[PDB]
Design a protein around this ligand. Sequence first.
Ligand code: MN
Ligand code: MN
Ligand code: MN
Ligand code: NA
Length: 281
Amino acid sequence: GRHMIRLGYPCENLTLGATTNRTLRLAHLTEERVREKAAENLRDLERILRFNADHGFALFRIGQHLIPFASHPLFPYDWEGAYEEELARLGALARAFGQRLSMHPGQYVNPGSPDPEVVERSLAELRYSARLLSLLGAEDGVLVLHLGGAYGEKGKALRRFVENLRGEEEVLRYLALENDERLWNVEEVLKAAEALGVPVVVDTLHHALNPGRLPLEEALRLAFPTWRGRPKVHLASQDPKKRPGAHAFRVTREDWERLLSALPGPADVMVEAKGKEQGLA
Ligand SMILES: [Mn+2]
Ligand SMILES: [Mn+2]
Ligand SMILES: [Mn+2]
Ligand code: NA
């Protein structure tokens, strides 16, 4: 059924054994082997889009390794010329299905690092991610990022984060910032996001562990105005008795309920659960 709240899951589908996330060792980074992996990941991207259209999922997060090692100085070919046509085609499918596409670079992507080498590698990775979403024609695509490390002093870490991203026209087309469970709350992310002119993704588990002064309801209410399009939110549940913020297999009914009650209006909810497409109902 057609709900005002659209759902998604990241990277892979467990029912199908489909993934967008195959990689390889850099010792095996041959033109032929990468083309191998990329092809299977693109095949799987397509199956997933089709499975989502038949099973009520409007959102999908494409894993970083879709084109394995694309941002790496040893990448064996022009991936954009190789794939532009097929990405446009997959992009048109996703739009025909009404699907919204996203990527979330890992915890080692840190534009606010003071190490210039980490900055350059991080920027390379975000530029590849943004180019991919551009080639898929993802008009409302999202590229989600945590604010990363305090590196001893937050004011300076944030100023580096903004300086190192303000110039990046293409990345800024898609970039949205997300609160975390340890270092940067929603009030903090809203400040960073305004400086950069980008939206805020509220994560409900992270919010719970690290709320600042804000009830979830006010967090969502402040975040909603930061999206020109449909706001995106993350939904996870605590994996019982494990490390705080560890993701449960399936989201609880109680946690789903609490978000539904807090949302100020229509939004897109990425379910971050170890079960993937089995993470809710
Ligand atoms: Mn996140
Ligand atoms: Mn999250
Ligand atoms: Mn999390
Ligand atoms: Na409730």
